[PDB]
Amino acid sequence: AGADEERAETARLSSFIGAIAIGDLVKSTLGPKGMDKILLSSGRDASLMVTNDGATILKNIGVDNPAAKVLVDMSRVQDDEVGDGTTSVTVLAAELLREAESLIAKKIHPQTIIAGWREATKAARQALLNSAVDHGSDEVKFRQDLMNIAGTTLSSKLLTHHKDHFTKLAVEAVLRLKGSGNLEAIHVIKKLGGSLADSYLDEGFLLDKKIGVNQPKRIENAKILIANTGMDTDKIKIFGSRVRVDSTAKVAEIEHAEKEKMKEKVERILKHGINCFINRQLIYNYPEQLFGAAGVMAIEHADFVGVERLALVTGGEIASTFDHPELVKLGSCKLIEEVMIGEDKLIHFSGVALGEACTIVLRGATQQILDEAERSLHDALCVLAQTVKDSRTVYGGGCSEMLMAHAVTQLASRTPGKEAVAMESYAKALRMLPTIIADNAGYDSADLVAQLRAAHSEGKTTAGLDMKEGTIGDMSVLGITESFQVKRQVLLSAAEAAEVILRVDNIIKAAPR
Amino acid sequence: AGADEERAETARLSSFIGAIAIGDLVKSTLGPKGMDKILLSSGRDASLMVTNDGATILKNIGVDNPAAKVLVDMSRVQDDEVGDGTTSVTVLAAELLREAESLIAKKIHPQTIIAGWREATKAARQALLNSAVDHGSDEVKFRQDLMNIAGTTLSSKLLTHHKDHFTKLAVEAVLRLKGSGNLEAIHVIKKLGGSLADSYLDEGFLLDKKIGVNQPKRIENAKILIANTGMDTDKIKIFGSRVRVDSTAKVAEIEHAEKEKMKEKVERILKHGINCFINRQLIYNYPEQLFGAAGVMAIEHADFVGVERLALVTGGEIASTFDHPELVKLGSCKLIEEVMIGEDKLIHFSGVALGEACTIVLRGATQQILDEAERSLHDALCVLAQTVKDSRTVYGGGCSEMLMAHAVTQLASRTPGKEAVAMESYAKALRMLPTIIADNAGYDSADLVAQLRAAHSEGKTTAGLDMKEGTIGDMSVLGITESFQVKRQVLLSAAEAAEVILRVDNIIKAAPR
Amino acid sequence: AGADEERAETARLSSFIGAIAIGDLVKSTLGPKGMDKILLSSGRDASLMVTNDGATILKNIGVDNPAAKVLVDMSRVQDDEVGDGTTSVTVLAAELLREAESLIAKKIHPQTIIAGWREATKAARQALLNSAVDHGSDEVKFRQDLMNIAGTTLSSKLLTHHKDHFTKLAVEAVLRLKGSGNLEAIHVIKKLGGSLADSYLDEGFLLDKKIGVNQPKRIENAKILIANTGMDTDKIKIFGSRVRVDSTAKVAEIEHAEKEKMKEKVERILKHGINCFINRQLIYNYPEQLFGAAGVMAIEHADFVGVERLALVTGGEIASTFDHPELVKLGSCKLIEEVMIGEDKLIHFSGVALGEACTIVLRGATQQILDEAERSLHDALCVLAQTVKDSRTVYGGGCSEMLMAHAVTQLASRTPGKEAVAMESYAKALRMLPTIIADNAGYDSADLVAQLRAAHSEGKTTAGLDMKEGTIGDMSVLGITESFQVKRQVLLSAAEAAEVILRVDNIIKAAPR
């Protein structure tokens, strides 16, 4: 009724099962005709979170007892190195487990076979030199700014009609970013409005919060205040306890003390000419009445992540206790206002003196699938930063993968004894990628594999898998390219996570009913 | 239609389970290091009989519901006109069923994969033409007549402690048989009465019948008479009983006439010199008295199979009515006599002018184990005969199989569409065979599998698995060669037998009659 | 009723089963080709733990009803004295139980046999120096410093791919360590930055903290201050009374008092020229503003363990209240600076006058698998300190083990009576160790045993088992060696464990449910 009970060879199967379950969900995602899945959970989860990107969803949740979470964690380091485009690295590791059925048939030492991963070490190198043509991306780049790799990341995604334009916008963002800054202070949010452009570029920062129903609608020549400590006051670290006293006047004094906090906030707020107050946490009610009459707009529970970027942008400030206003606070001033984007209320910070950090605001159809824009968008910013830095790329659509696969078949026969079995199993691992790209396309996977191998074997590097075509075609015309870095790291990365899987095999549970 | 309804999965599976059960028992059976197996059962049993030959035991027993019995039955047709040597035909068909679990992962159309079988046949011939297949067997051949393939057949067999000598004798029989065409006239009977040699070779045919206690014991310059019709005269095919005559004048017509059948037989017999009479059926008492006085030895209800084999040997005749003597009859005239070999009196036919066929005539230490030799004898008979008809042979010890395996791996890369997928799986399967030959040796499979592969790759078709060596060596020095027919039929048969169950539509009842 | 009550012959068997189950898991953890295992448990466990070291996992959990937990507990006392090496003591004790089946056959008195153990001490003595040690270990040394025993300690460990290189590094650490006082002046930390080398050796102590963003980055002619008390001032644990404030006006008197703490710290600080301040606990903010203007770099919440190490290194200091500066404090004069390491911020202390203590920094990819490296360093530091001081070692790879067995077999036969039966069995047990080392290698154990014996018999102490080779070779070229302490202690410790199980007829427990 529950049984379980796994030993030695069946123990191995638990490693096997984890790989097959993950592969089916992720396979649909890779390629232009991608698929969207929604996940719901309760208990510290609100509802219906859907992620197209395989890396974000696996990383967030550790659903069950079988081991697989450690493999998932590793993908993020890859993400940091370069990461994305389409999520293909996890699938490659999963298929490597299928050969292990063969290993029981081999019936000698499975660890000797482990030499195959070491063998894979220069297999990676073989693909590091012979693959694609397309290098540098000089600087700023007129035409070559995009209409390339960001588009390929998008090609897998289904929003690529209007969206390819959005992608084009993202490289403009990286050009300003470019410098000794590295990769910081860029935030982009979607909006429920409908426009052909579906996106806008903001010179400053965008936030979605309001002081309350009352307060002036707009502020000019605004001063910005950011406070680490909340407006709420009464419970310090040690209470001073709960006490009685004994007079008909003393209980009144504590209420009076509250007024003093109110007094400091208004009198010095006015000297500064403060137009907006932003605090990352809860805000005490008393000051709120004060802000409305004064003509000062404040934000309750503003997110910290938005605040830190904003600080670099406005010159920053020293966020301490109420002494915080005046000189210790740097306030840039152009326009802070709630702007009618089209459908909803937003607050715009703009005209930043620094210029180092800028914000992009997206507009879309609406309903969690517009979150798709965040999904594509997250991928867009990161890909570009290394495309310029790496100074080289390889052909996409699996063109790179089939070529290496043809080369590795030769290698297995060449290695003596034990090694040839191990090396050849690694070699067909490359074969599934063409199959995965074709499968989500809906075209028949079996036919696709055979036709593909003949074109790569012939000697044309440009030729690859064309999903729209339903056969093979010229990758370069499409503009699909993969970062050279994604290929170097993935080959090194797949082996180490997969290797962990063979070395485990034993999971222990005790007894019946 | 009969019943037993199945379609996709949990249909495919029943065939899958039947194949796995057969493979483990037959596995230890193959080559030099084979083993004898004993089974315990009730019914017309009550004892354990050891059958080394897989085909003999399978025909005898039909233990359970799943259907593998029909697959089993087929091996016998092969056995009668080629068959044996080592049991691999059943194992080769069984191993391809395993890929089906891999196939569910492929998840499309089993039949699309099936296109591989036509190619497997086209490729198999391509592979058959792509192998060295030895170069020797000059014709007759002074030493490599045997000590090669028959020895391997006997090797699995228990009797090989002294029987390997018996195997050597069998090739002598085939060389004389060789000539334009037919297999016929090979039959052997074992005799109780041990000798170190364990066999005596008769130049003619061995039979076990006698005319009666009376008659000349030995006949010289013998003429042989064969009759389709028996010597019994009175009844056409209606008994009419012995009866009583319905008049004094009608008794005379039948009984006097009976004397005439006697008289016709005597006058024709004396002129010919007829020393022996062989008739396929019942024989009348009246002639029997005459044969003793005449000096002619006759055989009652002689078996037809012995007679037909005998006809090539004696030149044959047209077996009509009693007119049959003289020119219409052709009888060889060297030596016919009844010889007591040592127990179970036998009759020896000797002196075949044609030379085309002989009876061998085995004998031994007198054990039921001795009758085991009768079973292993059969294996020697058809593998060798094919060798004379084909004028072709292949290198043994898996030399042919490893070479073919290396050649086939590159072939899959060469092909497109249907061809690429089906062909590589086929190529991979050849790899397991080297492993089984090495494993039964007792040496470690791992060291053996590619050390072997390197040798074949170089181009030495002679080099192969040397079981006695424990590693790899020169097969040609060993002299082991396999006939061309055993290799073409096994490969063609394996693919289709496998194919029929997957495609399967019914295969319903166990019912004969 | 049911139950599981055991007496005499039956009671012995439960002890027997526990020993066999443990040996199979531990056998794979011996020599260069050892395997890592991971265990998952629930009820009072966090996440899966992988323990290469047999001792750590066995101590942590008592999984089931059979008795073996107590046998396990003893190995830890050994670990303190010398410990680790490679786990093998448990294996040797377990195999001694197999001879017990033989013992029933002996059928006299099981404790009579205990005499053989006394002989075992004599036999152990015979092989404690007769073949003749290792040579050199002069102190400091060149080539023989590593690629020896540390490699062997790590041999059992999977991490030994990149890791064996780490092991090589450790002897360099012991060379500085050797001197007037054991282990306690060495600090090791792992990093989140990946590199193939995976480690660096620092001339001084390594820390990972910064004052904040301000203050000078680099200091010269540096002076170091360490405090056992925080810079925090106010409450103490008796407030100086419970006092209320009418409004935040009179508490200002208290604020002025705070400034006194500020000035005392600066006055003492400037005269010294104070380059860097390190405090083990929380730090008060007022001081911090002061340090930046002065040009002094301070460290907040630096760990105490690091500080103790630093004191021996810098001549030390007496840590007390703010009278701490000047003469009670001693500071090293070379170089303190913050140097970027990988993806983390680190501060390097260097140029220590003492020279006695140094620090090694490890990096690695970024996974809890990586945290494996710290598990290994601790076993690395202890073994080496012992290896130089004991000035005696024996050849590894089982070289010593076969050799002792050859000498002991003769001893049994030479002795005339009762003593000989007991003594011979002990000699037999040594045979399994060569077999166990070979079995985890994936090579045939039987072939390995005889080939091994022939090389040892010759008289070459340098010869031994090479798993990578698959046969026998020169251990010395590899450099693998075992420390002297493990061999003397194993021989006497093993005898005590075997003796207790044989002697106990009656346990009396229960508990299954």
Curated annotation (Swiss-Prot), chains A, B, C:
<dbReference type="GO" id="GO:0005832">
    <property type="term" value="C:chaperonin-containing T-complex"/>
</dbReference>
<dbReference type="GO" id="GO:0051131">
    <property type="term" value="P:chaperone-mediated protein complex assembly"/>
</dbReference>
<dbReference type="GO" id="GO:1904874">
    <property type="term" value="P:positive regulation of telomerase RNA localization to Cajal body"/>
</dbReference>
<feature type="modified residue" description="Phosphoserine">
    <location>
        <position position="47"/>
    </location>
</feature>
<feature type="binding site">
    <location>
        <position position="86"/>
    </location>
    <ligand>
        <name>ATP</name>
    </ligand>
</feature>
<keyword id="KW-0067">ATP-binding</keyword>
<feature type="modified residue" description="Phosphoserine">
    <location>
        <position position="247"/>
    </location>
</feature>
<keyword id="KW-0479">Metal-binding</keyword>
<dbReference type="InterPro" id="IPR002194">
    <property type="entry name" value="Chaperonin_TCP-1_CS"/>
</dbReference>
<protein>
    <recommendedName>
        <fullName>T-complex protein 1 subunit beta</fullName>
        <ecNumber>3.6.1.-</ecNumber>
    </recommendedName>
</protein>
<comment type="subunit">
    <text>Component of the chaperonin-containing T-complex (TRiC), a hexadecamer composed of two identical back-to-back stacked rings enclosing a protein folding chamber. Each ring is made up of eight different subunits: TCP1/CCT1, CCT2, CCT3, CCT4, CCT5, CCT6A/CCT6, CCT7, CCT8. Interacts with PACRG. Interacts with FLCN. Interacts with DLEC1. Interacts with SVEP1.</text>
</comment>
<dbReference type="GO" id="GO:0006457">
    <property type="term" value="P:protein folding"/>
</dbReference>
<dbReference type="InterPro" id="IPR053374">
    <property type="entry name" value="TCP-1_chaperonin"/>
</dbReference>
<feature type="modified residue" description="N6-acetyllysine">
    <location>
        <position position="168"/>
    </location>
</feature>
<keyword id="KW-0547">Nucleotide-binding</keyword>
<dbReference type="GO" id="GO:0050821">
    <property type="term" value="P:protein stabilization"/>
</dbReference>
<dbReference type="InterPro" id="IPR027413">
    <property type="entry name" value="GROEL-like_equatorial_sf"/>
</dbReference>
<dbReference type="GO" id="GO:0032212">
    <property type="term" value="P:positive regulation of telomere maintenance via telomerase"/>
</dbReference>
<keyword id="KW-0832">Ubl conjugation</keyword>
<keyword id="KW-0143">Chaperone</keyword>
<keyword id="KW-1017">Isopeptide bond</keyword>
<dbReference type="GO" id="GO:0090666">
    <property type="term" value="P:scaRNA localization to Cajal body"/>
</dbReference>
<feature type="binding site">
    <location>
        <position position="487"/>
    </location>
    <ligand>
        <name>ATP</name>
    </ligand>
</feature>
<dbReference type="GO" id="GO:0051082">
    <property type="term" value="F:unfolded protein binding"/>
</dbReference>
<dbReference type="GO" id="GO:0002199">
    <property type="term" value="C:zona pellucida receptor complex"/>
</dbReference>
<feature type="modified residue" description="N6-acetyllysine">
    <location>
        <position position="141"/>
    </location>
</feature>
<feature type="modified residue" description="Phosphothreonine">
    <location>
        <position position="248"/>
    </location>
</feature>
<dbReference type="GO" id="GO:0051086">
    <property type="term" value="P:chaperone mediated protein folding independent of cofactor"/>
</dbReference>
<feature type="binding site">
    <location>
        <position position="397"/>
    </location>
    <ligand>
        <name>ADP</name>
    </ligand>
</feature>
<keyword id="KW-0597">Phosphoprotein</keyword>
<feature type="binding site">
    <location>
        <position position="487"/>
    </location>
    <ligand>
        <name>ADP</name>
    </ligand>
</feature>
<feature type="binding site">
    <location>
        <position position="84"/>
    </location>
    <ligand>
        <name>Mg(2+)</name>
    </ligand>
</feature>
<dbReference type="GO" id="GO:0031625">
    <property type="term" value="F:ubiquitin protein ligase binding"/>
</dbReference>
<comment type="function">
    <text>Component of the chaperonin-containing T-complex (TRiC), a molecular chaperone complex that assists the folding of actin, tubulin and other proteins upon ATP hydrolysis. The TRiC complex mediates the folding of WRAP53/TCAB1, thereby regulating telomere maintenance. As part of the TRiC complex may play a role in the assembly of BBSome, a complex involved in ciliogenesis regulating transports vesicles to the cilia.</text>
</comment>
<feature type="binding site">
    <location>
        <position position="31"/>
    </location>
    <ligand>
        <name>ATP</name>
    </ligand>
</feature>
<feature type="binding site">
    <location>
        <position position="156"/>
    </location>
    <ligand>
        <name>ADP</name>
    </ligand>
</feature>
<feature type="binding site">
    <location>
        <position position="482"/>
    </location>
    <ligand>
        <name>ATP</name>
    </ligand>
</feature>
<dbReference type="Pfam" id="PF00118">
    <property type="entry name" value="Cpn60_TCP1"/>
</dbReference>
<dbReference type="GO" id="GO:0007339">
    <property type="term" value="P:binding of sperm to zona pellucida"/>
</dbReference>
<feature type="binding site">
    <location>
        <position position="88"/>
    </location>
    <ligand>
        <name>ADP</name>
    </ligand>
</feature>
<keyword id="KW-0378">Hydrolase</keyword>
<dbReference type="GO" id="GO:0005874">
    <property type="term" value="C:microtubule"/>
</dbReference>
